[PDB]
Design a protein around this nucleic acid. Sequence first.
DNA 1: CACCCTTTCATTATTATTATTTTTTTTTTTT
Lengths: 241, 102, 219, 328
Amino acid sequence: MRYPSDIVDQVLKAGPDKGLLTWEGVDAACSHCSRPIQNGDLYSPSSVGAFFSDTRDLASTSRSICWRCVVLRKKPMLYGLSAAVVTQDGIYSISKDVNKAWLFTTPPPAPFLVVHSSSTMQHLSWRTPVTLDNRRIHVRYGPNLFIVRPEVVRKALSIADRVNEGQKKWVTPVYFDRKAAAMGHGLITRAGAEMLTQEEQEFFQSVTPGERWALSYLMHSKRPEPEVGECITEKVMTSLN
Amino acid sequence: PADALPGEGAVREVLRPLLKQAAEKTAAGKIVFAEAATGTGKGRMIASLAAAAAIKGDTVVVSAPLAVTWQLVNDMKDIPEVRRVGLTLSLGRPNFISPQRT
Amino acid sequence: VNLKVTIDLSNPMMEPGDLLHLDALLGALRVSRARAEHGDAINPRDYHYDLPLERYQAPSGDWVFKASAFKLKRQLPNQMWMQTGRLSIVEAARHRQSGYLQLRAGKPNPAGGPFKTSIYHRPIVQAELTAFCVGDQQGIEALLSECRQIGGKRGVGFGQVAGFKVEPVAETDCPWSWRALPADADPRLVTSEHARCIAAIRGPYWDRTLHVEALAPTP
Amino acid sequence: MQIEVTVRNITPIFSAAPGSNYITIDGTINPPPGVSRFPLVRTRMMYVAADVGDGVIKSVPLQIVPGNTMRSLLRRTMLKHVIEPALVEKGNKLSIGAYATAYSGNATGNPDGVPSSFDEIATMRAHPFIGLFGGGPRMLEGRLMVDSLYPIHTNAERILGAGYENEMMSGPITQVVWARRMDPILNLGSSEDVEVINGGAVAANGWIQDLLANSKAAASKKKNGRGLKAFNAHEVVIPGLKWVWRISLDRPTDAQVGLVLLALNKMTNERIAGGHSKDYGRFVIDGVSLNGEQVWSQSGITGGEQYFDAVAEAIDGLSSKEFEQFAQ
DNA sequence: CACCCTTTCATTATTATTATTTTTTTTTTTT
Ligand SMILES: [Zn+2]
């Protein structure tokens, strides 16, 4: 629950790789995980070739990987965790819009880890903090750390559904980019500026980019509904073994 | 008014702050934009600035319209510092008349 | 003294991931001041706690600075900035022939490596930044006089400070509590928008090794 | 310390922007669907705050060069004009990962997080080139803050500040320059023009039927290859515009400021554009102000001789082992 | 083991985009 590397034992079952070294000397934090590698814990030296782009998101500089995020740095843990929530019971893929209606809006569990890939494959699961309580969702998307709240997103959905009530055609009140790469991400639409009031415009403008990024996947022409996820835990276990 | 400028005591209390930073940033060599309303007595504050610059050894020039001239030299007669360093006026050809023609 | 600080911007700034804390700004400013007043070979850990603020201690350890986070009032819509990174391959080829470059590889890679082209997008906000803190106004003015940028010390031109202002305000008006707090904070200090998470409460807020179990507000 | 470089662009300025931008043939930007549109890559513009008009703040577009382009242009002109001749008159051979750290802002010397002692942080921030930007696995803050190239424009009066009201532009500063590519096989005249082609008439005819079949098939699909015949558009900033460039150095040495000054002495041969084929981004320098005092002359830089002597003895003494020790 | 090639895997899916509407005065006290 404390670290992202706690998904390696509490959720899925995995062990350290053969050939990893035990930690010596004074205890230092991991280069990736931010977990303090105490003595008696297994670790790896950093022997990456010159293709690791994620130097900016290294937690520390101790040149040492904790064994749990040695496991998280292997390739099936990279591509198989491209879009998933890792709660205390299983790993659920969230690539469906209905799943992001399930997690962003009224999620059942409190503790989890939410990862989504902007690109094809990035080092993602170890650099994101664990969502502890549901009221503050921590999401990673690409090189971006994001915060989502359920109640504010529910308020936004209620506002948009009541202002879109009575219209057969769905009109987007405020545009949000799915890639979060366009300049117009977060911009109020023209008609949506009419059918929202000024306080509603300020409320939809004041949200953190995580809620904007969630409302991209959740506020659009067809509207998702919250249904639970297909468990990809056995899938990424079969990929890993 | 401890460590006051020359002629500060005849300047009103509201214009004292403008006068102090105006003298300070003209002591630094900058061109000072000092703004006050009409009835706040800008002539007395200008007199304080002119006297406080005049005791430094500076050749001080005060440019003003000819209507403002009489009250400006009225604010520049009784303070002892401009009495010591002197006050003069520069006037042109349109300040005088031809004697033969008149 | 229980005062309150606004910063208005001559340039748009990076919208901060999580909270821009005022004590982080003052710590970076004091680090820059210590770099001016000693030199370059110093420890930034030594002086980024030497702040003219109050230090709140939670009931069982876990002390934090008495400085709330920067609340944002958007003067502008939250736009986006794009930046890219790539090494110029043409000069690399001419340096490889001239002998100034020693490159065994005869091919670059835009997806990874030294010649990787990278595109990345960050939110951009032009805003009035208002924080609330208990401390000495003169020291905050002396720190913020050097504050030419805020939110990102990017060196590329963002967050340039048009100005700053500090005023004392009454006790009941000031929401100091809107800050990343420890979970053992007082019941009058925990609010509804606070939630339990992993966050830094002190010093370097980017250092994930110092991140603790904290109750913090949402920007 | 601050260096403000006021330049005029001899040629247009083009720094391409992301997003999918569409213009009609008349000039309407981003049309509603159901009408013919056109690909358009606008120059980079930010929405900035404006106190023009009323006292309340309004969001106005402002067409700039990004500061990253400025930073890389200053970096690359220091490498191309003073650093590389010094390092090849000595015989120095850089390594990839040290060349990548000097020439780009990348950490492929060691992708690992390299620990940095405070003494080595001090000894690399005092380097004449390295301490300006930093970069690499150390990820140390460079001393050089390079701002965006801002045009002297009324939308930028908050960014520009007071004092630029004289010699100031207003109104639109972007022109949508239309460019095109023709299929040059259609340009082929006769047997003398076609004899250099292997196949000649047969190959030219075969490409003409291939292009014809592809175009008629695409038009029948409208009621995945692509031909050479293109016609597109791109917004550029107007040539002859005046620009300010702010370069603020966080506690610099004399040699670092001398390196920036010798960059400005030789940056007339450099370009600032996404239009290198079209000679876009050629500029001349009209003013360089150091700490508020102008120093640029028509025959390069006249003034700051202490900076010039400092940078001369700095670039003479470098032997590129400091670049390698900066990388790893 | 430091220098590279070249293979490999991944699940959902949609698309909106700010730009303007003066009056025509005769002051002042220079060479
Ligand atoms: Zn770990």
